[PDB]
Amino acid sequence: MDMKEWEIFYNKIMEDFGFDKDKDVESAVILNNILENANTIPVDKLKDIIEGREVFIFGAGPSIKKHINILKELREINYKNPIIVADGACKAFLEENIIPDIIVSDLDGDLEALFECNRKGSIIVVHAHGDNIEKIKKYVPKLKNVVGSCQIPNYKELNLRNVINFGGFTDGDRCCFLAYHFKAKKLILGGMDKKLEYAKTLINYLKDKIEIEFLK
C-alpha cells in the first residue's frame, strides 16, 4: 500500500538474484539521456488510453494463441479495449493481425516483431535494466512513440525526468503496474504461465488494490 516499500523489494530482488545495482542505475541514466531528444510520447497520452477502461494484458504463455482468438471474437461485439503486450508476445498479435496499443519491452528478444508493430502505431514502453544497455543505445533511436521505464526506485532524485517507474519485476507485471498507475478499472490477463514466483507475488499484491481476473 506504498511504493517506497517497493524500494525495499527492489533490494530483496537485486541481492536475491545478484544483479549489479550499478548497471541498473547506469542504464537508467543512459535512457533518460537518450530520451531528452528522442521520438517520445507525452506520457499523459497513456492516461487517456487507460484511465477508466478495462485493459487486456498479454504475456507469452502456453495460452497465447488460443486466448488471442478470444480477443478476436470479443472485438466484433463493438467491444474493443486497450491492449498491453509483454515484450515478444507482439509477434502473436502480428500473426493474428492485432496491433497492441502499448508494448512494455526491455528489447531482450528479436526486434523484428516489435519494430513492425511500432510503425503500425504501437506505443513502445522501453524499460531499462542491467543487461540491455547497448540495446537501448542502438534501438531506441530507431523507434517512434517511445516511453522510458527503469527498475531503479531512486529515479526522481537522480533527475530522470524522461523516465517513470511504476513498480514491477518481470516485464509482464510492469504492464499491470502501468495499467494500475494509469487508473485502469480491471485487468484481464492472458497467456499466463524462479522469476515467475516473484511475478505471482506482485500480481497477488495487485489483486488487493485493483480487480484482476485472469482469463482461461
From Swiss-Prot:
It is an enzyme of class 2 (transferase). Keywords: ATP-binding, Kinase, Magnesium, Nucleotide-binding, Transferase. It comes from the Archaea. InterPro entries: HMPDK_MptE (IPR027510), MptE-like (IPR002826), TPK_catalytic_sf (IPR036759). Its EC number is 2.7.6.3. It catalyses: 6-hydroxymethyl-7,8-dihydropterin + ATP = (7,8-dihydropterin-6-yl)methyl diphosphate + AMP + H(+). Pathway: Cofactor biosynthesis; 5,6,7,8-tetrahydromethanopterin biosynthesis. Its cofactor is Mg(2+). This is 6-hydroxymethyl-7,8-dihydropterin pyrophosphokinase. It comes from Methanocaldococcus jannaschii (strain ATCC 43067 / DSM 2661 / JAL-1 / JCM 10045 / NBRC 100440) (Methanococcus jannaschii). The gene is mptE.
